[PDB]
Curated annotation (Swiss-Prot):
Highest taxon in the source lineage: Eukaryota
Amino-acid positions noted as binding a 1,2-diacyl-sn-glycero-3-phospho-(1D-myo-inositol-4,5-bisphosphate) in the UniProt annotation, renumbered to this chain: 108, 143-144
Post-translational modification: Phosphorylated on tyrosine residues.
PDZ domain residues: 7-86, 91-166
Record-given protein name: Syntenin-1
The entry's keywords: Acetylation, Cell junction, Cell membrane, Cytoplasm, Cytoskeleton, Endoplasmic reticulum, Lipid-binding, Membrane, Nucleus, Phosphoprotein, Repeat, Secreted
Covered range of the whole protein: 108 to 298 of 298
MF terms in GO: cytoskeletal anchor activity; frizzled binding; identical protein binding; interleukin-5 receptor binding; phosphatidylinositol-4,5-bisphosphate binding; protein heterodimerization activity; protein sequestering activity; syndecan binding
Record flagged with keyword Endoplasmic reticulum: yes
Function: Multifunctional adapter protein involved in diverse array of functions including trafficking of transmembrane proteins, neuro and immunomodulation, exosome biogenesis, and tumorigenesis. Positively regulates TGFB1-mediated SMAD2/3 activation and TGFB1-induced epithelial-to-mesenchymal transition (EMT) and cell migration in various cell types. May increase TGFB1 signaling by enhancing cell-surface expression of TGFR1 by preventing the interaction between TGFR1 and CAV1 and subsequent CAV1-dependent internalization and degradation of TGFR1.
Expressed in which tissues: Expressed in lung cancers, including adenocarcinoma, squamous cell carcinoma and small-cell carcinoma (at protein level). Widely expressed. Expressed in fetal kidney, liver, lung and brain. In adult highest expression in heart and placenta.
Outcome of substituting residue 108 to D: Disruption of the cooperative binding of C-terminal peptides from FZD7 and phosphatidylinositol-4,5-bisphosphate
Major place of residence: other
Subunit and interaction comment: Monomer and homodimer. Interacts with SDC1, SDC2, SDC3, SDC4, NRXN2, EPHA7, EPHB1, NF2 isoform 1, TGFA and IL5RA. Interacts with NFASC and PTPRJ. Interacts with SDCBP2. Interacts with PDCD6IP. Forms a complex with PDCD6IP and SDC2. Interacts (via C-terminus) with TGFBR1. Binds to FZD7; this interaction is increased by inositol trisphosphate (IP3). Interacts with SMO.
Length: 191
């Protein structure tokens, strides 16, 4: 999670898609879903990202509807965006013990309990928090067992990006669970 406002240049695919859905939150515009194999995922937009400008125009107080309209119109040749990195989220680094645990209970991706004398405890992991990423891979919409599997298949170091549930639940609203399961880019970035 950068303190960074950064710039991305986006290019519509052949179908006129950039693979993005945006959502109005507290008078900003935030990324609600980034699609696998999209211009948006290639240029490295992330769920939780805030779009400050599109083609030099300020997003403050746009409705979701309008931001979708703005994107639809733009000459797909070059859409430029100004992005603040996942402002509502924080990262925590943890270390698995000998048992290979980091010490929490989560349920529907929401953390619900911290285990005494765990790495999770030492690091001040919080409950009422939705897991957004693990080691920089988006895990939103995956089932808990799949999330569990990623934590198993992980190094001894584990990195989790988390978002206050009230905020997460207001972001995903109006997005069908299946869309999230199927289309939200759950891949490791490309180089």
């Amino acid at each position: 999670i950068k303190q960074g406002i950064r710039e991305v240049i986006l290019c519509k695919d052949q179908d006129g898609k950039i693979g993005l859905r945006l959502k109005s939150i507290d008078n900003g515009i935030f990324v609600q879903l980034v699609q696998a194999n999209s211009p948006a995922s290639l240029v490295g937009l992330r769920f939780g990202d805030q779009v400050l400008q599109i083609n030099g125009e300020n997003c403050a107080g746009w409705s979701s509807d309008k931001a979708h309209k703005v994107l639809k119109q733009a000459f797909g040749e070059k859409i430029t965006m100004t992005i603040r990195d996942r402002p509502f989220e924080r990262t925590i680094t943890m270390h698995k013990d000998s048992t290979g645990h980091v010490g929490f209970i989560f349920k529907n991706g929401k953390i619900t309990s911290i285990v005494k004398d765990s790495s999770a405890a030492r690091n001040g992991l919080l409950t009422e928090h939705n897991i957004c990423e693990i080691n920089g891979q988006n895990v939103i919409g995956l089932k808990d067992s799949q999330i569990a599997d990623i934590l198993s298949t992980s190094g001894t170091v584990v990195t989790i990006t988390i978002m206050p549930a009230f905020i997460f639940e207001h972001i995903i609203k109006r997005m069908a669970p299946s869309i999230m399961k199927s289309l939200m880019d759950h891949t490791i970035p490309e180089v």
